[PDB]
Amino acid sequence: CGLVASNLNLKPGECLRVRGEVAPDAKSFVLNLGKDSNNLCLHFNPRFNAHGDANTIVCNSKDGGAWGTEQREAVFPFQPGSVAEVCITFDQANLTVKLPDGYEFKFPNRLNLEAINYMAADGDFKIKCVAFD
Amino acid sequence: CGLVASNLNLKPGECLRVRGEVAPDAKSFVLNLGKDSNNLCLHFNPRFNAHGDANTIVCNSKDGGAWGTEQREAVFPFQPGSVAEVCITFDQANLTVKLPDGYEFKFPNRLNLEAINYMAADGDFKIKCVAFD
Numbered sequence A, B: 001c002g003l004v005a006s007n008l009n010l011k012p013g014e015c016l017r018v019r020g021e022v023a024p025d026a027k028s029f030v031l032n033l034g035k036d037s038n039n040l041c042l043h044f045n046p047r048f049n050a051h052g053d054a055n056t057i058v059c060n061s062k063d064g065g066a067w068g069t070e071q072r073e074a075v076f077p078f079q080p081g082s083v084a085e086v087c088i089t090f091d092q093a094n095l096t097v098k099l100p101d102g103y104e105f106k107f108p109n110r111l112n113l114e115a116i117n118y119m120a121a122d123g124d125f126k127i128k129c130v131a132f133d
């Protein structure tokens, strides 16, 4: 329902910087990354109040259409109705997700992707800027 | 084939900014904007040395798969081996294309689109940032 991008050609060590607006009534937003819509290295899902979670980031993978096992993070530097920037890089072992206010976490590269070509936003997150370092 | 973005929901008067690196041996690049690959309100094609043309911007539309009447511009503010920003807006009458070196031109809006939802880049231009005002 938000921006979808393909042919991103993001390679290991490169930095994808995504800035957007968190809706003021936000309950949840999503940023998906991977090979395509059925093969996600990162389903990144901050939940303000949704699917049974309060102020928790849920992450998952999707492999040939099948969801993996969710991982729940320990930090949440997002507020409804504000701008947020997320920066992502990956290597053979992990994606590294950098968040506002100095937070960051790692999520295993379960699909062993060597390139990230697909991104999609959904939920209460309006992308304003995508930049490639 | 370069970055493709959909669901852009660019409304009249909003600005789309694209910054990229022009290859040192560039021949031609394309930014396509519209609804989808068959419906382009703007095919923007700087030709450094391509199709018999030298340092000429070629523009066209595509409606239901059919190319419109091509137009050429009179200024070529691009250099191989350098970074360039392009900035595009639209209303019902025209698209306005703002380029480096202060140059700006209008191209008639020959489709009826409520919003620009699709953008594809191709050719000798590596996209470094995209912004939606």
Ligand SMILES: CCCO[C@@H]1O[C@H](CO)[C@@H](O[C@@H]2O[C@H](CO)[C@H](O)[C@H](OCc3cn(C)nn3)[C@H]2O)[C@H](O)[C@H]1NC(C)=O
Residues within 6 Å of the ligand: A029, A030, A043, A045, A051, A052, A053, A058, A059, A060, A067, A070, A122, A123
């Ligand atoms: C009844 C629930 C109690 O159990 C829950 O069962 C839901 C449905 O399986 C899980 O939620 C699902 O988790 C998936 C990623 O793993 C995706 O996030 C799905 O959203 C897809 C989406 C949203 N957007 C905006 N775009 N795509 C989301 O519905 C949810 O974690 C889990 N909650 C828990 C265990 O506490």
Ligand SMILES: CCCO[C@@H]1O[C@H](CO)[C@@H](O[C@@H]2O[C@H](CO)[C@H](O)[C@H](OCc3cn(C)nn3)[C@H]2O)[C@H](O)[C@H]1NC(C)=O
Residues within 6 Å of the ligand: B030, B043, B045, B051, B052, B058, B059, B060, B067, B070, B122
């Ligand atoms: C005007 C009618 C007859 O004269 C020539 O007929 C070619 C093919 O009809 C035109 O070339 C075509 O112009 C189009 C935009 O009008 C697009 O740019 C096409 O490329 C689309 C594309 C392919 N790819 C891989 N990426 N982009 C390009 O092939 C060429 O300008 C044209 N005019 C001149 C003076 O030369």
